[PDB]
Amino acid sequence: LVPRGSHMLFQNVSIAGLAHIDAPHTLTSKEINERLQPTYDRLGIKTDVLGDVAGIHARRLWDQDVQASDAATQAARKALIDANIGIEKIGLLINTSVSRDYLEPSTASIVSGNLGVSDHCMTFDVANACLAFINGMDIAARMLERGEIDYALVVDGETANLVYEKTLERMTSPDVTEEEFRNELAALTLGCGAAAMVMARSELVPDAPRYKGGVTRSATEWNKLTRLLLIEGIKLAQKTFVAAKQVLGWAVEELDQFVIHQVSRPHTAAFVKSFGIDPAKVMTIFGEHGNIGPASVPIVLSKLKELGRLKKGDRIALLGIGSGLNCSMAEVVW
Amino acid sequence: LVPRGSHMLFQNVSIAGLAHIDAPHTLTSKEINERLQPTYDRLGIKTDVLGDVAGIHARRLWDQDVQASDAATQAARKALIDANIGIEKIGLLINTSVSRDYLEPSTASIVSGNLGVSDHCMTFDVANACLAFINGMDIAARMLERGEIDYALVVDGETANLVYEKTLERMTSPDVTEEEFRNELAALTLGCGAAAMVMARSELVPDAPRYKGGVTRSATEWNKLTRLLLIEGIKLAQKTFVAAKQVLGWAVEELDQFVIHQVSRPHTAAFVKSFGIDPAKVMTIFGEHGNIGPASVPIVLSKLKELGRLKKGDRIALLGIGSGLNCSMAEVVW
Numbered sequence A, B: 001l002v003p004r005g006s007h008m009l010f011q012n013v014s015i016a017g018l019a020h021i022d023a024p025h026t027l028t029s030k031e032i033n034e035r036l037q038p039t040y041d042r043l044g045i046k047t048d049v050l051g052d053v054a055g056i057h058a059r060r061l062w063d064q065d066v067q068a069s070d071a072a073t074q075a076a077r078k079a080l081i082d083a084n085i086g087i088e089k090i091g092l093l094i095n096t097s098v099s100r101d102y103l104e105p106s107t108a109s110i111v112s113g114n115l116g117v118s119d120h121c122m123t124f125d126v127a128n129a130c131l132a133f134i135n136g137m138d139i140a141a142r143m144l145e146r147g148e149i150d151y152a153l154v155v156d157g158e159t160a161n162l163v164y165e166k167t168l169e170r171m172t173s174p175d176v177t178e179e180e181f182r183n184e185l186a187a188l189t190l191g192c193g194a195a196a197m198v199m200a201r202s203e204l205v206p207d208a209p210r211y212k213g214g215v216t217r218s219a220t221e222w223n224k225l226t227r228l229l230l231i232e233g234i235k236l237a238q239k240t241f242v243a244a245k246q247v248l249g250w251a252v253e254e255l256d257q258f259v260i261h262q263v264s265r266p267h268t269a270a271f272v273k274s275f276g277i278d279p280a281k282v283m284t285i286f287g288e289h290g291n292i293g294p295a296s297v298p299i300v301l302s303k304l305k306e307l308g309r310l311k312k313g314d315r316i317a318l319l320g321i322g323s324g325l326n327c328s329m330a331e332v333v334w
């Protein structure tokens, strides 16, 4: 009768498989600047905003015209192998990427068709900026927990190639301001990549990592969004951390890893300081891969696994602040 | 221990409120043709494809530059009034429209900000072509059923104005084929409008309509998709109807209303004939409103309510065939 935080946690949802794809083509910030230099000089800016402001030394791009669905498909094939199961076991496939093939059909239906899902497989896309992979995990988790399905795929492929092309062109244009130039530099922190996760009812995969679920808080009053964005973002994260304490029983020091979506080096710096987090428990790929949007979290989790910096029983925080503003925080126990 | 179809149905999820918005501006197919006539003649086509092929006499457009989020917001305000509850009760807001304000943030976060949702309110978009409102209902239903929330908004605003403008321009172009002209005529069956639904835990709204849930089947092998589309669509719907029999206990004759997404008059005709459905139990707005995409189903349900052609105990089938291909069928008991 009496509600407790732990009541809303999932008891029988696990991570059966997990994979990521690193996009092959390394584009250094060194090169981008060589191309921007006549516009840096021309604008009188001695600031390497990319290398030691945003703190990005390189990002990965695709080598060819890879569609979001292609990248998600490749990651999904890898995750199925990791889980050691055939596509026929999948009852749900959710796509969570920002990158999108078409207006319709859903990117999820395209990935599903590529993989050869059965006619029982439910598919749809979830869109929520940088937090959507966590949303997709949670949505799949509720179907698993309820027993509507036994296995689910959550996939996310991101391509920034066209953005980089369109963006590099507008910033080397003659009639471009220092405002625009700055307003567009942000696109140049984005990276390509993909990730997929197979989730399953725990009894089908004894001893697999457990997904407990998590909490979300929002500040949609700020959906219009600068230092203001960092300040409101941190304030939202503070209140989300209170919710996490109330549901997950989180204390910053009892967590073993923080898998955090990253916007820039100084953003992550401000967050880590605000919460008193030990920076050693925060793996970062932003410096060499840039911001891979909603794929960032599972890619980092996947890299931790393969490295392999994870041990059974480890408490792993998954979190991010997304446009909205929204903030989500969820726990995996390895 | 032993699974039964009825087990996966929701027992404590109801529809607390429901509203629709009719877009104000009537554009008759008469007018569109007056503008297309020099291209009909020029192409030697005596075929009024719109009026007595697709069977659309008129569709509604917006009078001004209405964004999806604006239309969804207006419908949501109306649904809250219908449910007699303040926005502060809402723990989840899902947007399901095809029309989309920006790449980010989600359209849902924009609507939420407009309405003034509390910081506890979770938001995200679901994208799945014409079936997404049903997906959003189901996603909200699982959170309600589980007790994670007490009230949810599912909203959907559609705007076709720009499509109609871009489309009318390409079909009155000199160098346009009869193929292209036909390949684009389809955009001219789309209409504008909006709908929103407040869902709630049944005990909070005794005697409100009950949402039971439903089933989905897919044929993602056909995600590339003509008479072929109709044939595969009907075949998919046949198998989805078997699933509905197995879960919902559906027999065509025991249903009181069929709320069906509509692509065109001959499409709906073929469907109704294939299933032996009494056409009198199928309200249609396509002739005067066109195809409002994923908003079509809740708009028709909302019009049935206000008319009011619904009585307590009525078994109401919600269904559609969407790009993917996917097909979903769910039941509401009024």
Ligand SMILES: C/C=C/C/C=C/CCC(=O)[C@@H](O)CC(N)=O
Binding pocket: A128, A129, A130, A131, A229, A230, A231, A233, A234, A262, A263, A267, A268, A270, A271, A291, A293, A321, A322, A323, A324
């Ligand atoms: C630590 C403070 C964070 C400020 C918030 C920035 C928004 C981040 C982005 O714009 C993208 O990286 C992802 C997103 N918005 O969902």
Ligand SMILES: C/C=C/C/C=C/CCC(=O)[C@@H](O)CC(N)=O
Binding pocket: B128, B129, B130, B131, B229, B230, B231, B233, B234, B262, B263, B267, B268, B270, B271, B291, B293, B321, B322, B323, B324
């Ligand atoms: C009855 C047979 C239906 C054929 C399927 C057509 C696809 C319909 C559409 O293209 C849109 O109206 C909605 C959608 N695809 O989700």
Ligand SMILES: [Mn+2]
Binding pocket: A024, A025, A026, A063
């Ligand atoms: Mn290369």
Ligand SMILES: [Mn+2]
Binding pocket: A207, A208, A209, A312, A313, A334
């Ligand atoms: Mn373990």
Ligand SMILES: [Mn+2]
Binding pocket: B024, B025, B026, B063
């Ligand atoms: Mn008008």
Ligand SMILES: [Mn+2]
Binding pocket: B207, B208, B209, B312, B313, B334
């Ligand atoms: Mn009743």
Ligand SMILES: [Xe]
Binding pocket: A015, A016, A017, A018, A208, A209
């Ligand atoms: Xe895993």
Ligand SMILES: [Xe]
Binding pocket: A241, A252, A275, A317
């Ligand atoms: Xe945290």
Ligand SMILES: [Xe]
Binding pocket: B015, B016, B017, B018, B208, B209
């Ligand atoms: Xe209702």
Ligand SMILES: [Xe]
Binding pocket: B241, B252, B275, B317
């Ligand atoms: Xe049906």
